Design a protein around this ligand. Structure first.
Ligand code: A1L0N
Ligand code: CA
Length: 258
């Protein structure tokens, strides 16, 4: 596997606040075409090969600040992280899906050479919080060539996603009453194709805003899903299959083995 980056993982090494790669950043003007700009976090070491990329969208009326902690956390494990702002703070889930693809296209076509030369433009993912999570599902319908999708406590009015072809990892919050898992996160996951590689993780006692503050249980398995599907790295299947039993997890569902 030519996309394998970093040493062989352990349960502690995926919980590490800093991975094996150092992080540099680039700021992108809000007048970039198709999205509201953002901050790119990328690994600085080039001697192991180029990296895949994930665009990170925020929720309704939120900004990249609410998703900022993913930046260094994930990119230090060998990914290019693009925390973006939306065109307006009121953008709908469909609008946030189009803007996630616009951010990924900016990385490929127009990003700074320091970023371009570290990027594998064929290995791209999407991630989003709340309405940005509903945008992550919309992004995979709009671009089924993406490698992974991670809706965090997602909110969407449309509950059926039976045509999704991108490995999707949904994270729900037990005490979410803004996008309750019983009418949002769980219906989305169960509607995903039975054959798709997918997973659902419900955090115990978590609120709708748990993705906005550093969370090891979120971090360790966001990194595992991204390595497993953006890097095709089967060294991270051990963490995902069989289903994790972390004390922080109150409900886990998957289509293991993968
Ligand atoms: O209008 C509603 O009912 C409504 C429902 C959910 C959201 P959200 O994107 O999950 O909020 C999280 C942003 O930090 C916004 C509005
Ligand atoms: Ca713009």
């Amino acid at each position: 596997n030519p996309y394998e980056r970093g040493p062989d993982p352990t349960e502690d090494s995926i919980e590490a606040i800093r991975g094996p790669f150092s992080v540099a950043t680039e700021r992108v003007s809000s007048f970039a075409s198709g999205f509201g700009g953002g901050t790119i976090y990328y690994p600085r070491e080039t001697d192991e090969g180029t990296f895949g990329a994930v665009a990170v969208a925020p929720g309704f009326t939120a900004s990249q600040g609410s998703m900022s902690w993913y930046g260094e956390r994930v990119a230090s494990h060998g990914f290019i992280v693009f925390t973006i702002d939306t065109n307006t703070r009121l953008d709908a889930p469909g609008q946030r899906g189009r803007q996630l693809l616009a951010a990924l296209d900016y990385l490929v076509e127009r990003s700074d050479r320091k970023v371009r030369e570290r990027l594998d433009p064929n290995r791209l993912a999407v991630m989003g919080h709340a309405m940005g999570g509903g945008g992550s599902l919309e992004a995979t319908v709009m671009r089924p060539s993406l490698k992974a999708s991670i809706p965090l406590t997602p909110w969407h009015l449309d509950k059926t996603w039976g045509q999704v072809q991108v490995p999707t990892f949904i994270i729900g919050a037990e005490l979410d009453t803004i996008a309750p898992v019983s009418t949002h996160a769980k219906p989305f996951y169960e509607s995903l194709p039975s054959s798709l590689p997918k997973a659902y993780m419900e955090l115990c006692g978590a609120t709708h805003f748990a993705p906005n503050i550093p969370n090891t249980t979120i971090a360790k398995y966001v990194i595992s899903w991204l390595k497993r599907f953006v890097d095709e790295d089967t060294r991270y299947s051990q963490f995902l299959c069989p289903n994790p039993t972390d004390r922080a997890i109150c409900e886990y569902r998957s289509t293991c083995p993968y």
